[PDB]
Design a protein around this nucleic acid. Structure first.
Ligand SMILES: [Mg+2]
Ligand SMILES: [Mg+2]
Ligand SMILES: [Mg+2]
Ligand SMILES: [Mg+2]
Ligand SMILES: [Mg+2]
Ligand SMILES: [Mg+2]
Ligand SMILES: [Mg+2]
Ligand SMILES: [Mg+2]
Ligand SMILES: [Mg+2]
Lengths: 63, 107, 50, 92, 131
RNA sequence: CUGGGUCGGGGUUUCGUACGUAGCAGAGCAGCUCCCUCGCUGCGAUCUAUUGAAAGUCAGCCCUCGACACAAGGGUUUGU
RNA sequence: CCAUAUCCGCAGCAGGUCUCCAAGGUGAACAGCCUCUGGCAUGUUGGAACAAUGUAGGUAAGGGAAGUCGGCAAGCCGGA
């Protein structure tokens, strides 16, 4: 088994969950639930969405 | 002991649940009437109008989720019906329902 | 209740051999039973009889 | 706990089993699915046939078991990882 | 000497997938599939790896008004691999072949699915990406 | 089995960061006059800090043993 | 009285029967949506629970008329 990280957020995945997507340019993305997909597909940058890891690292939230 | 009063808080959201938009608040008052009847073993119940206003204060669809009251037993001073006791329900206004218990008031 | 499980596979001649798979299960609770009594039967041309 | 993960975890999910409770007893683990609702009583009988097909004779050794909560979209195995990831909340 | 491992079918008859290779085609109107007996009032669906019979609707006059075989390479309908992952490819695409499985063009655009590269080796060679 | 109910507290989980206060953040603005136009009445969407916060969470989710009373009573029939 | 109860329709019948007066907001507008003056108690009865088939409304992964005598019905476009 391998764990993988979501592509919109940076949360973890265990191997029973999720979906995977392969845009026809020759790239793949992992997603964890319908919430995150719809965000990705609707062309939203995760650095505003304040429940994600990237936001928390950019605004130095925590520490 | 047989003339007594005390305070409660009630969760309406779990008693009215699954009901349509034209029967929610009216069934609240029925439930309240059930609550007392099982609580104080009395089949006679009155309701104060301040309480009714509170329930209908956001219409008939949207009914608040919790509320506090006061119950009182009484002994038919100016009434002679086949019942000898009656209960009474009144309203208490509150900013927050946190951490509150069923206290017993003494007067 | 129910859940799922990962295991490894040693079915030979397959396309999933020496690999991992994912599959569901059911969980069944089972304390130990207790014996209280006995009953003995007998065989007859109408069937059995207690 | 398999022979591989070696985490001090139980079979019970987070938030317990839905509509049932908390298992504190010996259990068995079946492949697939069964009849009936939860909390229902089952009977488990030995097979009346002979078993020679490889798909019956084979043997198994597990690697991983999932203890996510089923009362939503579980994403953590245990509370301990839930805390180490997030951090200290207003429970201070 | 393996298997195929049934998957979820997405492309019934009446669909127009796009073609990937470099022969001149743009569309492929499906008309039937290989390997279906059938049931009353059911439509013969198709998936990845499945070989089908197709016509062209946009391309060169030399190819139109004729029947060809084709093989499917990408679909948008989620399907399960035995590793517990569901997958999809943004589009529906095919390529033209002959009976024996030898492909007619020389190149392929985009990614090919693992589930057809196993069966058809000649397609697998000409593909840049995979899965 | 002293039990089960009502409220409460925790667990899980859904959406996505509450009112207020502070801000030398803020396109600009004309009034004030200590002309200061960073000093102010302030006009002002929006942004940042308190704040992964607030709100909801069995009514057919999990656990408690914390508070409250309550539970011996009723009615109709049955013979080898 | 002058009409979803005083008129005709067998009846306090969802039918039909000539005219006058005519506010605030949005908006091109006596359109449609909310309100004040004035009027009413849901239109010949009520309570409990949410099975089947119905009538009126809605939504649906992938494909898109392959359905059917027939794109019938629904849906798309819709103002400046
Ligand atoms: Mg679940
Ligand atoms: Mg037919
Ligand atoms: Mg109206
Ligand atoms: Mg009525
Ligand atoms: Mg009438
Ligand atoms: Mg559809
Ligand atoms: Mg036809
Ligand atoms: Mg036909
Ligand atoms: Mg029409």
């Amino acid at each position: 088994m391998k764990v993988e990280l979501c592509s919109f957020s940076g949360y973890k995945i265990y191997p029973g969950h999720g979906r995977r997507y392969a845009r026809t340019d020759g790239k793949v993305f992992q997603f964890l639930n319908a919430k995150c997909e719809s965000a990705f597909l609707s062309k939203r940058n995760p650095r505003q969405i304040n429940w994600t890891v990237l936001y928390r690292r950019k605004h130095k939230k925590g520490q | 002991n047989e003339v007594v009063t005390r305070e409660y808080t009630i969760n309406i959201h779990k008693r009215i649940h699954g009901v349509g938009f034209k029967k929610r608040a009216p069934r609240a008052l029925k439930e309240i009437r059930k609550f007392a009847m099982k609580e104080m073993g009395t089949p006679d119940v009155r309701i104060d109008t301040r309480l009714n206003k509170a329930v209908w204060a956001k219409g008939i669809r949207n009914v608040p989720y919790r509320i506090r009251v006061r119950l009182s037993r009484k002994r038919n001073e100016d009434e002679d019906s086949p019942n000898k006791l009656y209960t009474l329900v009144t309203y208490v206004p509150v900013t927050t329902f946190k951490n509150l218990q069923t206290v017993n008031v003494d007067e | 209740g129910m859940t799922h499980i990962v295991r490894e596979v040693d079915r030979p001649g397959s396309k999933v051999n020496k690999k991992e798979v994912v599959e569901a299960v059911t969980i069944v609770e089972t304390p130990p039973m207790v014996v209280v009594g006995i009953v003995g039967y007998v065989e007859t041309p109408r069937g059995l009889r207690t | 706990s398999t022979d591989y993960d070696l985490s001090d975890k139980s079979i019970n999910p987070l938030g317990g089993f839905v509509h049932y409770g908390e298992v504190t007893n010996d259990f068995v683990m079946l492949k697939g699915c069964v009849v009936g609702t939860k909390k229902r009583v089952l009977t488990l009988r030995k097979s009346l046939l002979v078993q020679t097909k490889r798909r019956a004779l084979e043997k198994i050794d597990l690697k991983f078991i999932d203890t996510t909560s089923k009362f939503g979209h579980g994403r953590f195995q245990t509370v301990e990882e839930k805390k180490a990831f997030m951090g200290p909340l207003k429970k201070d | 000497s393996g298997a195929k491992f049934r998957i979820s079918l997405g492309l019934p008859v009446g669909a127009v997938i796009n073609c990937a290779d470099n022969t001149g085609a743009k569309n492929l109107y499906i008309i039937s599939v290989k390997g279906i007996k059938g049931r009353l009032n059911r439509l013969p669906a198709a998936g990845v790896g499945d070989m089908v019979m197709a016509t062209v609707k946009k391309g060169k006059p030399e190819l139109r008004k004729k029947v060809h075989p084709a093989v499917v390479i990408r679909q948008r309908k989620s399907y399960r691999r035995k590793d517990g992952v569901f997958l999809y490819f943004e589009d529906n695409a095919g390529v033209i072949v002959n009976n024996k499985g030898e492909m007619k063009g020389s190149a392929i655009t985009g990614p090919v699915a693992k589930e057809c590269a196993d069966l058809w080796p000649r397609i697998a060679s000409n593909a840049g990406s995979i899965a």
